[PDB]
Amino acid sequence: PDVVLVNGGEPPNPLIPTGTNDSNGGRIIDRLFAGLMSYDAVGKPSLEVAQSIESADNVNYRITVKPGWKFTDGSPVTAHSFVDAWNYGALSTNAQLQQHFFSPIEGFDDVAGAPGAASRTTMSGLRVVNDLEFTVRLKAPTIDFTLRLGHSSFYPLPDSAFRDMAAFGRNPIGNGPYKLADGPAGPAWEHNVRIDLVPNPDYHGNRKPRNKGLRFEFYANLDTAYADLLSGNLDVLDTIPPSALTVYQRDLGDHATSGPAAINQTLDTPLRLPHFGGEEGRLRRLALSAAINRPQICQQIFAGTRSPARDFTARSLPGFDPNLPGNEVLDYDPQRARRLWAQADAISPWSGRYAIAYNADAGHRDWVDAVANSIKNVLGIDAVAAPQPTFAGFRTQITNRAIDSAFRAGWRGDYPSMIEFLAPLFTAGAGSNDVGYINPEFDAALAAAEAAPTLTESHELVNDAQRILFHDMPVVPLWDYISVVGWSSQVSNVTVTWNGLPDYENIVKA
């Protein structure tokens, strides 16, 4: 094939930027759209669709849009294309999973779940000035507002989207480096099989493709994907299966690269489950954390390709500190785990089964089995693994709250900001808060970190806020990632970005 073959998975949700909170949809959406900023392979933003983004105070922003941009339907990209998409994302009626990213904008409280004017459908802080200029007024200084403007939640949408957003989500129309193929034998998106993309000839931004297209192959099994990589039937595999972690170097040589990536893994136990709410639940989550031996699993299960968590973010992010006071809650300590679990039993004695659900399509079986066995042996409870076949179905059950057990989760960074690893997961109203954790003192601490005038102060305030997380253990942080990516002999110029993904636009195929 002339296009670059890479791994992916079926998106759990339609291809609407503000409706996409997961990496399977995200890796597609990021090929199809271009935002005000684009990110390079280290996560630094540069002006893309914006001609300028000006703020002297982290509160008031003036955004000018470059003229001449268009969507692949021929329609122009204007200030409205942004403002209408952002208002769509923010308005609670539209139930967009990325709503949280709009929270600092004045008027968000009117349109989101907050006290305010419930007839209002748009945010007062977002104001069109002319066809190619708009202003943003935030409720408070927000140190990572500029940085987040490369993120998918802020992508522009064509006017036609709003007339029928369900139709748009099945057949999205964007302005970015690729577009969906009009392939020769069936639809570009073959659900549960693959998505085909081709270069967008209209596009003249910072991410111009160096290849003739991309095919995301939705593997049911990472061993199948590794076999395909070794035979040349797959060009880039961004996740080596556990079975291959001790042999990929022999198999691939200089065609595999490893490095820290801003991705983590957690064990999530909804607060709505039996025995896992209130103070009882807090004590049991602390006990689970003490019942897991992260160095041992990282060494043996992952062959050193994960690093034990020391906080709720990821080692490679700016301001990370692996020696925060109170992080001893993330050390293995069986006697402590039993004491905490017994303290929980003083409130209500445990009964039943502790099951850890996971998506089997991404290589989690070995670690989940190991964690369940550790919990069983340390605490003396019936702890088991509970596999589901696909990420899409698994996330759907998490989102609609049908899931009836604990489950694995984890975050791949969208931009390199510790706050971005915390606010979307642990603030009270966030769409990716999968467990129902609510602590207004934590939300206020994050707001204080956002209001800091300098990055150094902000980082130290984020780390202060993480003390609340050490106390509440909203989820159990496990490890962060050492990404290992392999590629075939038919491609070159493969760079792995700061968050573990291939730099797709820059892959070359002879």
């Binding site: 996409t20 909170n21 997961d22 990496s23 995200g26 991705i263 983590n264 893994q265 998506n359 991404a362 989690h364 990420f391 996330r395 694995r408 989760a409 984890g410 975050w411 791949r412 969208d414 990716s432």
Partner: peptide, 4 residues
């Protein structure tokens, strides 16, 4: 984004 949620991974996996």
């Amino acid at each position: 984004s949620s991974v996996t």
